[model samples]
Target: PGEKRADLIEIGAMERFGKLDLPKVAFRHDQHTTAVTGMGKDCAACHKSKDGKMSLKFMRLDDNSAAELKEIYHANCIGCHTDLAKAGKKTGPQDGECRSCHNPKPSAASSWKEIGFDKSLHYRHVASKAIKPVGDPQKNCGACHHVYDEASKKLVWGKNKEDSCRACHGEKPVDKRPALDTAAHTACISCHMDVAKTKAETGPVNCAGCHAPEAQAKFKVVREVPRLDRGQPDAALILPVPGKDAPREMKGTMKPVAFDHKAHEAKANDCRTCHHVRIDTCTACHTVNGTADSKFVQLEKAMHQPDSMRSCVGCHNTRVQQPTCAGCHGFIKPTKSDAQCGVCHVAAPGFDAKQVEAGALLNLKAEQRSQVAASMLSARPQPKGTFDLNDIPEKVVIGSIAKEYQPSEFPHRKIVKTLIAGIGEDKLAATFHIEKGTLCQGCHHNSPASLTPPKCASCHGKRGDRPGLKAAYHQQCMGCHDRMKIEKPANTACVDCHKER
Candidate 1:
């Protein structure tokens, strides 16, 4: 009825209250929005704002346990429904329609769309001159942009060295900082409201105005948006920045990494992809000897660790989790190798901290560095085919440990071909899967790259393990299918992949 459509909130408040006794309530926010707006009611009817910040939690500000929360929801929601019914207007489920609220599948299930300040959207704000009323409007970048300098231990504006809000306001709050939702509602809506006060055109200041499909379509999209003129280097030699308090100890030398700073900046929606906490250099926190400030995350481990999302290897590994890449990476067992490390750590004889700080670590110029990285990245020529079908076993029989489900014949050659072709089409995958028989190394791993490595039964012994062959096989095969979203061979049905003979 209003100018915008309200957003739907999935009220699965189970996590806050522990294991839920009842089903989660998928609250149709528009139902309340329509009713409230009709009565000239404001967000404060359901929301509570304190100090300049609004609460992420519904109905109230902070949190309490299940008992208090349940009563609160029942009292407020039911109270409103009863009031409307008494006024002779049609209202939602009030009294005995308990199942209406508890319905697992709501008619208009939330198709919640995510909104972001991409390069196009970012430029519109920058070009629109929305920040400061007076003086250079370009300087208004400082309004939303900031960096946390570890040396200063405070937020500062280092000219163009701006980062994403997500860097600080992540999915979940950390270090007492608000979560992304709270930060967005407070910062974005407040700014919009202020601009709106001037009676000038501005973006959304409410839930529906920002999240509704129709409203989102109204955003000004600009092609060929101007680049953010941050004084970041196009390419630079990445080395540990020497500190005064640094312990002069002996550690093995590492080749200085040639980083394409500008290129990587273009690859991401925001700088938070790498710089999660602050804009400070990685070495600032992750020191050689490990520092209390960084929680002793050594520089070596910080960049190379495969498990951590912040690490270089980890982020790249995350991309490989996609269905297109997962068909192979999902099956593969990870191991450390020179082939993987050497890409970043190319041989640089004289690349000490002293030479690095001076920007003379590499003899190559910026352009030369770019060329070198490009060459290293695109080194491998696309292979016509990976493995010979004749060489691979057509089918592998599994009767060695067969019990309930009789011996199953696995299509070994077919699996090999599929893995090969999956990577063959992708240049990045094709280039990295360089070593001979590397694709085969996915399932038959933990051994040297060979045509025929040790069998799965060799390492997957009978006992002393959390799971035996049947369970492990079920997990691996079904796990891969599940991740890739392959809807074949019902994972639960034992007869789908196996036959009871």
Candidate 2:
């Protein structure tokens, strides 16, 4: 049997329920939805509503206990099935048909995929004229963005205080709140169903429409979504603030980083891309020292974790792995140093801790912080042009150890020119490669980027810890070619680069 049924939903299979006496029921949700609709009934046939919102549970608003839940499921399910059968209509298993509903082994498997609410989808909802704002007349964000008010015990639009949905709705329900899956389906589908009544362009209501891989691939992406208005900062300073009793020296040593928040916002797919837990500053949880809120991840590690997509360094590292940059960056291992830190952690001119305390940096006016960040960004060095054209050799023959084949004529200038042209107008490349001889370091690595660097033979001898000259040459040349996807001279086709004697 096929394992990729998007509509597959295994019922009564929650891990919290412990071991089951019989196999969980494999239900096709979309099939039931179709059948229910065909019978002139709506989602209210299975899902009950409370507080003007549809509950995702089947024929119940709350899940009290396992014993009660079993009774609820069996009674409602079999009763409906029996009623349909008596009416001369096709239906599901009735009373005493336990094996039909709960089989020992289920063949169908769930292929449900979590759909990301990226900027494109978010913007679509925002721009839709059909979706009226819940509270605010001017803003449409109130329709979806809400916070649970403890005082009233109701969800309310919090304006600028909006956070990611996963913050409250996690994998499992807590304190009568629905789980992430149930919450998402209820909120999304309910809104879509309402909008469909007006015959406007509405989102999917079926299981496979959003969960299927093919369905997700067909989602339209808006290339340039207008900047979201969430009262967020345009730019801000990042600095570790010492605790109340910390030493005064700590304040002097810390370097404040001018973060271009607007630039990063445009680059990210959603607020959750970096702010995974909630839409808050990274330092709110990840402080100077580790904290329980951040799971002991310090502020430094939070921003610089090499393997985490939520980190600044990690996100930039992903960009370098692209085909256009991989040819040069593949051989270069990242090393942290003061100079490297200065690249991103450049403090604005005349910035003093006394003027505004480190704690107050986050509260700075948007225009003021924007000016500070812009000044620092403008002061950054531009890419210095490489060595003159005449200075670089056009070609070089590698014949020092030629035995079976004639020396290969390497197109030195052409390769250098190609590498330089590949990085045309790329902001990341230009920012990192500001030095005059930065491009030359791609091949002449290990040595300081300069006009005259040591040759491969200088370091790579016949044999040692480092690969021999022949191995080094082949690996370097072919490795770069392979990474850059240069198909002309295949690694196996040696004669393409080297001529037979």
Candidate 3:
């Protein structure tokens, strides 16, 4: 319907005639459908059709008289009322029924509401897994946005071509179509209503269902929506050396930033969000000096652009936001001063002019600065620190809650003493296990504080099916050891922790 409706049938007439702003006569469809159709008047009672097309765009079809159009509406509309009256059903207008729909004043508010296709709405569709992804996203975007191009005479897919229908199809398009608000409401609601028959979760059909605050809240999320990938370039290499047309600021003494390619594939919803209309490298459309066609963003400005993921440093800055490492680094600034770049790029004695060219040099700078971060992470002055516990309860009394097996006694304080001994001098371990009670919280969770908690077998039975005990042990001691490179505790050697069962 939307595709056919984009056809500008009456646009030419509006331009030819100018401002055909006739007063709209409001009418209810559902009530009238029930009242009139109850008496066997089909859709044609109000809908006048010729050649199978309704009277929507123009009041009079080609070669029809203005009086002819008026006669058609009055005769059909009044004819229905007369029939309804004769049939003893409730009825409508006469010549004197001046204003059932029309009033001299304009309406202040809209009678209808509209819904949006936001992330929450998308989540409901994904969670249902009923409506499948339609087509190649680019081609699908073009299916709705840009239709057949007449001059080039080809169906062009959206490369950089994707745009929300709202961009051009705002209320009352300059072209021959209903406003975007009208188009979207008609199409999306109708489709959801249709799909709702078999797929109950497809969602609401009315304007209020989508736009109303309470109604929109009903949409569910998948918690983890698989990132949509549309074959975007992963990593980009920012070349350092200046050529004949090299950019003015490109002469800095620094090696090119080797952008991480794999990580970016998980970051966004649509490639078109970044690739707006073209897939070429930033420098292709936006040159050093800048082209008139792609004015505004210069090549240097594009790659080094602040707050944009396309920039070398911008995306990596986001990784620092993760809570996994955010605790220590969050307070540090994201801004890159000359001092920061020098950490990666080699430097010379007392800032020589020759040091400027060293920026473009690809060779690793003295491995010392990177070594600082790595060593900062490793076992302190003497490596090999270990966390004594994770999921394992510090005071688990393994005495049997069942009669099948002997209860294994858990050594509580001894294990902590042993862990402190094992984690000697590791900076990472010390920084992470900052709070004293935090180490104990590893196991005594969900219970009260400051006292030794209940026995593991008190809650867990003597059987190996012990609630979370077995899994807990594996996640804590074994988990931390494996991550921290402690080798003695793996299950590979059955005899390591116990004799052959």
Candidate 4:
């Protein structure tokens, strides 16, 4: 291995109007290569291609906007990860696993930082001719230059117009491209895939090749455009708020968030980031709560699903995965820590209640929270694991415990890690976990979170009288799962969760 980055990559999260804006994932590059395909590509196969590559590219959209960029990554990354894992391959973290990527102390820089080519860099490429010049800056224009004429509804390349795709399609999406990952990956690959058969070492034929900073460094630059195309609007007029029809739940006391159209346009990569279903109005299918076709999930759930990129929270959450914060949250879980919440949730006596009511305003709250979150950074209670033997029960003999699976010794510490880590010190968890001994409640349930609560016998009994443990696990698992209509761990296979143990 030339260099070894940690085996951790996750997405960031953002939520605007209660939607989870998930972006492309950063991964533990070294860890996932445990297996390879017939092509011998583990990470590189899907990620890199002759057109371009996208490892930690930040999930972008076709029409770049922070919100749209967020959704694109969520839609694409999760689908890819879920598909890969479902196909019996080792894969990535998933939906709702916000902590893995959106670390508390993420970077301030947007993913679109430029990797410019200096003279020396360009000279190497020109010397090799590995990168041949395509179309003149002006005449063969559109070859390199193109821009979105939102009014005209077409990519115009004319008189004052010739430019490179990157000139317009830089780190972020422009026109229909957004997020560095998708914008580059799809466009670059589509272009490359066509010429991949020719005698062209043209562009990277794999994803990791370009994405791995090391990989990019090794390749001698072939053709760096010293003077690229440049004809962008000096400023843009802001658009009016789309409508008065946000989900009922999102109508908190907060006023509608005003967007800085011109400023944001200059900052983003493309327009598609916000145009996934259509930028005009977000309420078409994604109303305040769920709709008929898209399901009845309220607007809040639709955006905050953790698995969605089209939501505000989803994208912003992905940004949180930068290094400083990942150290603590990455390996733990997608949950947030109390120490981290202080940066966003203003924990004083009078603050939280008002903000709490400001649900979808989670974005604003996260921003405002910076004021009070510093003190509570690591304010979590004592570790549950270090407790004396007198604390957790060492053994329980409930095996009529479930004949379907082996009787679990049920390591209390392990369960503590599972539950607490599953949620961490997240305000969402704290608010919902409800019990003081939240960890205990996950398994015991219907009880409180105290160190000592009534035993299992207090409610149910030794053997499940009506259904029994075997019946109970399946019932709860099946019912809630069915109600949720889970697609994975596919229901068709009865043995997915249980076997004849």
**Cα-based lDDT for every prediction:** 0.68, 0.80, 0.47, 0.45
Candidate 3 regions off by >4 Å? 1-16, 19-190, 197-200, 238-258, 261-285, 289-295, 300-336, 339-501
| Candidate numbers sorted by lDDT from highest down | 2, 1, 3, 4
The candidate with the higher lDDT, 1 or 3, is 1
**TM-score comparison, 2 vs 3, better candidate:** 2
Superior by TM-score: candidate 1 or candidate 3: 1
Task: Report per-prediction Cα RMSD to one decimal.
Answer: 10.6, 3.1, 16.5, 22.0
Highest lDDT among the candidates is held by which one? 2
Model 1, 1-501: lDDT tens digits are 223335667676755667766677767666677678788886678877788666656788766777777777788878888888999987877866776877676666444577888777887787775566233444677777666778999866656667677667888878867788878877787788788878876888656677777778888788676557766566555555444366556133565566657667776666655666767667667766567767877877888788777777877787798886786577776666676666577644434457644546434565555565454434423443345778778898866788877887777787777666655565446546656777667666667777677767777756475457776677777877777777776688788777987
For 280-352, candidate 4 gives per-residue lDDT tens digits of 3344555554456346555555445565655545654554343322322233333354533332333332345
User: Which residue pairs collide in model 2, if any?
Assistant: none
Instruction: For candidate 1, give the lDDT of residue 217.
Output: 89
Model 2: per-residue Cα lDDT over 1-501, one tens digit each: 557778986797243556778778878888899999999997888888888888777878767777777888888888889999999999999898899889767677777788868888888888889888778778888888888788978888888987678978899889888788778887898889999999999999998998998899998888768998988887766657543344664343456677878888887888998888887767677766656778968777888888789888888989888878899899776545566677787766765656656545555665676777777777776656678756888898888889988999998998888887887877778777756777788888877768888778888875347888889889889998889999968999889888999
Global Cα lDDT for candidate 4: 0.45
